[PDB]
């Protein structure tokens, strides 16, 4: 019944900067705990009993608070610290969790590397034709993708998926798939993937002709 | 060398049952209290069971009467027996070790998780398609129309680590689709072989598809 509300829900910090996140509670709790979950991984304990560093945890991590209000602090932000941070409360009815603060590292702006792939011959023999576009290793995260079929925009049948900030180089990647039947695919010739990112004022374009 | 390996996950129809297990190594199992915590598809964390020194067990209201936690201090295994499941029980199930010296309670090691899906939809294996088209070249692999999650994608039986990332699955009404990409030097491919190895545990499927030029 004690609700933990973390803020802000997303935040972004430059390298070497100091960062603080907050956990406000619906009423008093005895102790607060902090966990870190990197993309693809299991949660990891950072701070226990509101202010104690858990074994193995770098010294730049700190906790405090009391009553209904608690915080976690990173004194000097580093790239390996990009992750989602959760608080958890102990009290007479313990073990409710906050929703998470997602923390990204700022890095140098990077333009996407764009690739487009026509359907495989295996897919065509079953009557299907997926056209796939990868947009790899960009920063910042905000990006738009346009599909053009024979020079005109197409919006139906399009599915996007985005990755998390890579822990290694801190970039983002994106996938866009346009799924058609073999028959719709063979009634057009030019397929084009159009990416607009703030790193460039004109769009990055890749394309193929079905009969080339 | 503390290790927690969960297993038992899968797909269940609503109202069925399932038993999870967790195999612990590298510490004196019997000396520690243990918990199960799950992460939902929206990524909220949710405590579901504890067993504490002395054998007392505790559960939140939404699972009381349906879940039962227990332990085997001989072979160092933790269990979660789940019964009368509902669609809201779909999650990643983690097993955790409880901190010993604390004024409260907290979980100082987590396993890697075992995935549970509760749904009337039917198990369906994936179709796997190759993505073939500069000093570097990008190749890929399309994994279309499976249920439930997850699928596992590797490149050249793990031989390729850098240059690989896999996009989260997207669910299109009852079937998942995902894609995986890898980048290699132009002088590596096509003169050598690139294969994506896909595994789907739910359906007992394992395919290896070669990427070939056009
Ligand atoms: O571990 C748990 O999940 C339960 O822990 C109980 O506290 C234990 C603690 O784990 C031990 O380390 C210590 O030695 O003894 C404590 C004995 O209390 C909590 O009491 C329990 O919290 C909740 O308690 C309610 C009654 O107070 C009960 O209604 C809740 O169902 C129970 O979750 C906690 O769950």
Numbering used by the authors:
A (entry chain L): 1 to 29, 37 to 57, 65 to 72, 74 to 80, 83 to 229
B (entry chain H): 1 to 9, 11 to 30, 35 to 59, 63 to 72, 74 to 142, 149 to 229
Publication excerpt:
Capsular polysaccharides (CPSs) are major virulence factors that decorate the surfaces of many human bacterial pathogens. Previous studies have demonstrated that, in human antibodies, there is a biased usage of the VH3 gene family against carbohydrates, especially bacterial capsular polysaccharides, including capsular polysaccharides of Streptococcus pneumoniae type 23F, 8, 6B, and 3, Haemophilus influenzae type b, and Cryptococcus neoformans, but the preferred binding mechanism utilized by the VH3 gene family is not known. Toward understanding this highly conserved interaction, we generated a panel of mouse monoclonal antibodies (MAb) against Streptococcus pneumoniae serotype 3 CPS, determined an X-ray crystal structure of a protective MAb in complex with a hexasaccharide derived from enzymatic hydrolysis of the polysaccharide, and elucidated the structural requirements for this binding interaction. Pn3P is a linear polysaccharide consisting of -3)β-d-GlcpA(1– 4)β-d-Glcp(1- disaccharide repeating units.
